[PDB]
């Protein structure tokens, strides 16, 4: 209801703020997944050699 | 002696002609160095890709065999053998004389006095008179360490 | 015996006059005292800048050319035993050095004390008299490698 | 043979404990390389100023000690023949200079090569490779006696 109310009041501001929120959470999740994967590689690259 | 142990075990890497490095099949794991590139022989290894580790300048994987050089977590200093000469372990350094080495000496394995591989060399230091080498070793817990000889020149 | 051990292996320091001691490239670092200085012989090895440490009476740097050359690996264990050096033999008796009275003079500081197998245990800096035989002010290590200025009594540096 | 001819003629250019070649006197004037330089020993012939020449990568001056002392006559012609040099014999491959592969490298810059008559024909600078024989950077002369710098392919100057 907040989303549709703000979209009805200010369309462009609401669509750009939800677009920014979605883009920010997507980039954050992808970056943290890449960070976790790289940390996993750097952590278990010794132990896989025995 | 060492050649018989490394026969059909050390695989040359074709750099469009001559060889740049040797691949070593040990413990059910293939082994090949990143810093020198080329064409590996024996296409059963060429068909499989090898997952990388640039911090050790190396890349490893599995073995398609129906090749099992053992691990040495403990290396007494003494002296060991390699198919260009003898080496000595001096409290954190491996030692070779003046002229032995050269570009293309990377990827060579060093065994113990009877056959178990203890480490693999990837380069050396610019000095001589039993000088240090860029070698990848294993500790007492079976953990990989890239021993830095302050050389930064990969022979 | 020790002549082969120290041949072209350690260099002398200089006061622009007669010989006054030695500096030894040991373990990759120069072992050059504070109390005597002025000129490293073989100026090829004098271009290194030596950072100071007055707590152990040392100036040390990084050896150029081949670092592994002239190495002088250390030792950790210190049995009483029988130790060899430039003019003779010292005994490691209950934490001290016993050494004949006749050795010394200005020029003694700079002698590394060697074991039977050829590794350094101490490098001579000073001396002190105890009647029949003299004692030395020196720098030694311990079982874990900590460096101690071994000076049991009032000792003059050479 | 060539050892007798080059005895006390190839004076060492010097840097920091390493001999990086030599410098040679011909025609009453001193050669000195521009790609590699430093301190000329036997300072009685080092205090002179050597005016540079980048077109041939050399430096030339005058002899200070007397009118003649050390000198080497040139050869106006270059037969294929047989030419001795310090680390073996070099040959004229009808316009190409081949030297054995095992000899060469750093510290082999600014050196002469001598004919069978004992006169200098060319000045050694560098090196390349085409298999069993290697091609060296060189300063030579021509039929009119005009010096020419030969650098065959990607030759690496020593």
TrEMBL record, chain A:
Protein name stated in the entry: Structural polyprotein
Covered range of the whole protein: 673 to 722 of 1236
Q: Which domain of life is it from?
A: Viruses
The UniProt transmembrane annotation reads: 12-37
Report quaternary structure and partners: The precursor of protein E3/E2 and E1 form a heterodimer shortly after synthesis.
- Subcellular location, record wording: Host cell membrane; Host cytoplasm; Host nucleus; Virion membrane
